[PDB]
Amino acid sequence: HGHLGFLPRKRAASIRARVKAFPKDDRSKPVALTSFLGYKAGMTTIVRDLDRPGSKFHKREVVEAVTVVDTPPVVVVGVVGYVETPRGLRSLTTVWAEHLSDEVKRRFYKNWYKSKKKAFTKYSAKYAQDGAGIERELARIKKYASVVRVLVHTQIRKTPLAQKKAHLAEIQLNGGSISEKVDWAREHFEKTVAVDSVFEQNEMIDAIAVTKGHGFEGRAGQRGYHSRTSINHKIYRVGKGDDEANGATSFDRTKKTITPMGGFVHYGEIKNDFIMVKGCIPGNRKRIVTLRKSLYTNTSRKALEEVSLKWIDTASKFGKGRFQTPAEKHAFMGTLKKDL
Amino acid sequence: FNSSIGRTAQGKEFGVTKARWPAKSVKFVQGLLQNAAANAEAKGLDATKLYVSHIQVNQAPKQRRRTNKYESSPSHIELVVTEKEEAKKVVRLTSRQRGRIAAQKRIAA
């Protein structure tokens, strides 16, 4: 039994699942990130007004489960050059930004509270008078690198998570020559990149994550907590954190954000940018997830059709929720004893 | 003597994965350590320089009970604590070897 390609059923070496293939590059296009980092924040339900010629549900409305991924903008803190060799890709040079937040400096410690926090303090001394060493390393990357990846980290302090240690990753830069990639990275050092400058609505993306762990199960052995790469999840909405009426559509005029009544269960409210993706993705709430661009130019009309959302369910997920907003709940129940 | 015992993070101090907390053994050994420290005090040794220079456990005669063999495995323990203390080969050359040494000496100063 089982799909033999997902052997061995062993625990993933890390909680953050690796991106093992980026989209094939096209140098003529502008410089873009191939991938983004987010945190899974629960699911909900939407009503979509379907426009799909040929279908029995053409010009009719359907109800879909969706996943919400909390995506505050990522911070660019480094660049790494790769040279191809008869033995594969090899990293030649890593160049870091001059200043790094404590959010990312925590990633380099097991016991932050007890440390002198000396990480990158001697590195910052390279930006001293001329930046000659930094410029020499960037010149080396420009001269020899055939693949350029940018180092980014999440802003986990903007989430409701108890973790203060940010997740750090490499994201491939696609489009432009090597020198243009390196210039883009150098310009974006210590800057944020927003999720809408990477993805857009109606786009099909892939979700890479480590799945829910289940411990020992009856051959017997580890069940769950495996790296998985699920493909072709359509983006129903790229929402904005500073936008009220996140959950309001053209058909539903109720001014309300994406956050369900009482908050997501085991995850707070959404106060940042977010990605609403059709269906489910691997992982559970609060897990770090990697969103990747499609590896291939999708030939489906599903990748082409625009999504028109009619309604987003913001009822409580902490029970059998009946009301979208507390104002509606009060208007239904009426005046309670403690109101007088 | 560690077959099929539990794994513990407290082993990492010694590089092992299998460690335990044998209370009875600890009590006997520390009684012996206290006796040895008292003996050193009576002998007039400097208690700050004392380290366990010897310790040895071997098997005592077994004592049986019945309720199949049902025996205990008693121990003889001995230990010694000691003070730390800070801190012609003639050569047989042949005649040719002596001549070469002499030639080197003459060539040098």
Binding site: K29, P30, V31, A32, G175, E187, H188, K191, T192, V193, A194, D196, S197, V198, F199, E200, E203, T297, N298, T299, A303, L304 | -
Partner: protein, 52 residues
């Protein structure tokens, strides 16, 4: 039935992909690049506000 690796349907997918689908991809990427430039300009304007 034709397989996923069927050569005829693969050729049909290739000829379809070369057209309207790729055009949609290219337009999407151009817009995304434009708003990425807008994002960088916005942050640099905040830095200029700091300087001013």
């Amino acid at each position: 039935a034709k397989s996923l690796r069927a050569s005829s349907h693969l050729n049909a997918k290739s000829v379809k992909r070369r057209g309207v689908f790729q055009k949609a991809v290219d337009a999407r990427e151009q817009r995304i690049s434009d708003k990425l430039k807008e994002d960088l300009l916005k942050q640099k304007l905040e830095d200029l506000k700091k300087k001013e």
